Write a protein that binds this ligand. Structure first.
Ligand SMILES: COc1ccc2c(c1)[nH]c1c(C)nccc12
Ligand SMILES: COc1ccc2c(c1)[nH]c1c(C)nccc12
Lengths: 197, 277, 277, 191
């Protein structure tokens, strides 16, 4: 873990948002301002490590699969593998430690055998973030992250069959990204960076 | 520095071509940790090298603590399966589904084994795959391994076509391949008594069975024998005569193995960095 | 009064145990006429001896003129099939029909090959068969060959039970067998790496497969390997690794063949009659 | 074997195997009433020294049981034993002398037995048929070096006719008795 940064020298986040973009949500939480401190890129097949150092440095690396019910160009594991690769490119070298956070989100797009590879390459098992209304499960996301309080938001009440049936129904319907579920996940970070009111 | 024995992590090891090359070059192998699933391949690696190989079941079950305590490693070699990356297979599943995605397990464990950026100790790695793949897969593999491959064809040092891409940081990977007098370049150099070769180099050999009948014996055509196949791939004769294996099992193991003259070409510069005899 | 190479007529030769034993003894073989119909057995004798053997197909097509032109012969050896003379066969047809009557085809050609009257040049012969046979057939064979057999059990020099009758006139056929220290007398001496033997002598091995799981590897029952069977019968390792043969064919060939230390014992006195190294 | 003058022809010494032909040889003037014939039926324990102790033989006759007689042995047993004892009986090559032999089958030998018998006796058999009313009633095959035995053959009789006769069914010595007549030029006539 990283140590607390006092309020005077808290500097703005340098966010690397892969695939989807979270500029709107982040600036809704006061991490960005109107003016770009957030690099966004969707096709990283030709971007190499020197490109990440060029766009960097970065204090946060973010990636997320395409929405549920939106059949994608790429295979689902592609976003995961590319996020891992570019996260390795963006990690601070072990000589200079500094607060560095990352987060990958799945809108129930990765299948059963992709989730094992996910928990393997990300070294944690995902956090199930649901959207319940009237006692019924409307949407959900799985999250891998080292952001501090990311583990306490897990819903053990949501089983895997429930998630699979949700994904089946909402892909047979074929709805855009529900970023409301991951928005509160960034709040434990303002004690490390600046807040814009 | 003082040259010490080499420590090897071989993923998708197969019939232990890496261990065979390292021992045939005269290099002392301190630890050889091989990850193989096929019990036949593990059998031939267990007997033909007499238990010096430490076998591990599945590459997807190797953890970070596994790499940290099994190691340190000096040489991380691997050759992922090819039935989903090859072009000759119509039902191929690309680099991201099927057996093709096992490549990323290599890319994962390599970074686990890579030395910390404060340690400047010698550390070499090598990844092999087939030249027959869609250009997008070769690009993505080059993107993850952060380098481009050298194309080496076994036809220059063996009696069969076998073009393979090799990524790695081995010393002198790009130097020109030169054959040896011991190398058997023509098919007739690999046949048993009273066997004639109609071709001088047989076409690329895969796991499956007038190219199917490339020898003629006493006026009738015939297929190649297991000993002749082992000579073509450069293995010691009777290398795969293990565990009651027949024509099918032995040709399956040799069909997906490395051409050991090619691997001796790549591993020969390694004598300068590790202890020998 | 001078040493010349030996001239052999081998009926029902098989995998050429006679030629291999004679050559291992360092005896110059000038002619080895072998009569054999099994195809993979001829393939073994052809490759493992590089065509020094003259194969002459079925024994009932060998004429008197065939003997005189192919001859003169110094050593006439033979071993008629066993499956029609043994108690292992419920459908045993005895000595006079089935494959048992082929014994007389030896007796026939034996008298064709014996030297003429007024010619006392050295001439030796040997006929082998199984001990498990009806005593009427044994004494009938003794009547036609005009001699009684010596009984040699390979257990004294091999690692398996193999009791066989030997008719003939070889010098010192009655002398006591004494095993050399190269002979692997117990089953543990013939197993590959990481395999422990249950018995010290394995029961008799016929052409077909408790005592059929005589090896424990990694704490489980396993059968014998082809290389292990070759060492039990005394043959060189990979003597039968010929022409894509598997577990089925190799165990058949080695199951109806001679134990090579027994033939080395019987043939060793012949060094003092022919050219040597 | 060139013929012998009449003053010096000695009584023939014959060896009969598996069947006896004493009476048939007396009827032709080869044996005198009173003994020159050794007849053994079971030759299983016969060694060369026994055939040698028994006076030097001039004729070795063997024959299978008749066609109808249910057989004790397999049919090849008689052929093999006849061959072995014939080897024991023939003169050593240092002293040529008139020596003859004859083996007769009464359609008892099987088709493979016929080939092995012809290969062991170095001669294709001779078919001696009994034929009445244009139909073949019985027949015998013979292997022999007796001088005029090959011209007694009947090519009209095919192998399928012989096998059909065999499937349809005393030893017919009538068919083989005439085959010995060319031997009177070499041995004594007893009248
Ligand atoms: C012997 O060639 C192969 C083929 C597939 C695999 C292999 C070796 N090793 C594997 C491992 C360690 N995991 C999954 C698949 C394979
Ligand atoms: C390989 O053992 C055998 C068995 C039967 C025969 C043999 C060898 N050689 C034979 C010949 C030459 N003729 C007939 C049968 C056999």
């Amino acid at each position: 873990m990283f140590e607390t940064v006092p309020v005077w020298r808290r500097q703005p986040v340098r966010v690397l948002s892969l695939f989807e973009d979270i500029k709107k949500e982040l600036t809704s939480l006061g991490f960005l301002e109107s003016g770009g401190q957030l690099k966004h890129v969707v096709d990283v097949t030709d971007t190499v490590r020197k490109d990440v150092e060029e766009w960097g440095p970065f204090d946060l690396v973010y990636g997320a699969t395409p929405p549920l019910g939106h059949t994608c160009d790429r295979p689902p594991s592609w976003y995961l593998f590319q996020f891992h690769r570019l996260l390795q490119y963006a990690r601070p070298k072990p000589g200079s430690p500094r607060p560095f956070f990352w987060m990958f989100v799945d809108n129930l797009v990765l299948n059963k055998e992709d989730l094992d590879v996910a928990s393997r390459f990300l070294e944690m098992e995902p956090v199930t973030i649901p959207d319940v209304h009237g006692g019924s499960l409307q949407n959900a996301v799985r999250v891998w992250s080292n952001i501090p309080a990311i583990r306490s938001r897990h819903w053990a009440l949501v089983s895997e069959e429930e998630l699979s049936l949700l994904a089946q129904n909402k892909q047979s319907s074929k709805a855009k990204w529900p970023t409301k579920l991951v928005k509160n996940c960034f709040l434990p970070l303002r004690e490390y960076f600046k807040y814009f009111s | 520095m003082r040259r010490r024995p080499i420590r090897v992590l071989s993923l998708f090891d197969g019939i232990a071509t890496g261990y065979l090359v390292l021992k045939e070059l005269g290099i002392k192998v301190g630890k050889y940790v091989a990850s193989e699933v096929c019990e036949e391949s593990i059998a031939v690696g267990t007997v033909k090298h007499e238990g010096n190989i430490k076998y591990v079941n599945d590459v997807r079950n190797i953890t970070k603590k596994n790499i940290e305590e099994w190691g340190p490693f000096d040489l991380v070699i691997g050759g992922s399966p090819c039935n989903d990356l090859s072009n000759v297979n119509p039902a191929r599943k690309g680099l991201y589904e099927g057996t093709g995605r096992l490549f990323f397990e290599f890319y994962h464990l390599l970074n686990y084994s890579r030395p910390k950026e404060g340690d400047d100790r010698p550390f070499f790695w090598m990844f092999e795959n087939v030249v027959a793949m869609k250009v997008g897969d070769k690009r993505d593999i080059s993107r993850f391994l952060e380098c481009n491959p050298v194309m080496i064809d076994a036809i220059k040092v063996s009696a069969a076509h076998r073009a393979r891409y090799f990524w790695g940081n081995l010393p002198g990977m790009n130097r020109p391949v030169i054959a040896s007098k011991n190398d058997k370049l023509e098919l007739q150099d690999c046949l048993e008594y009273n066997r004639i070769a109609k071709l001088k180099k047989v076409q690329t050999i895969t796991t499956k069975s007038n190219q199917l009948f490339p020898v003629v014996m006493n006026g009738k055509e015939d297929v190649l024998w297991c000993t002749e196949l082992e000579r073509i791939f450069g293995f010691p004769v009777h290398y795969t005569d293990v565990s009651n294996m027949g024509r099918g099992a032995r040709q399956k193991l040799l069909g997906r193995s490395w051409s050991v003259p090619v691997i001796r070409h790549l591993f020969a510069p390694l004598k300068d960095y590790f202890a020998c005899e």
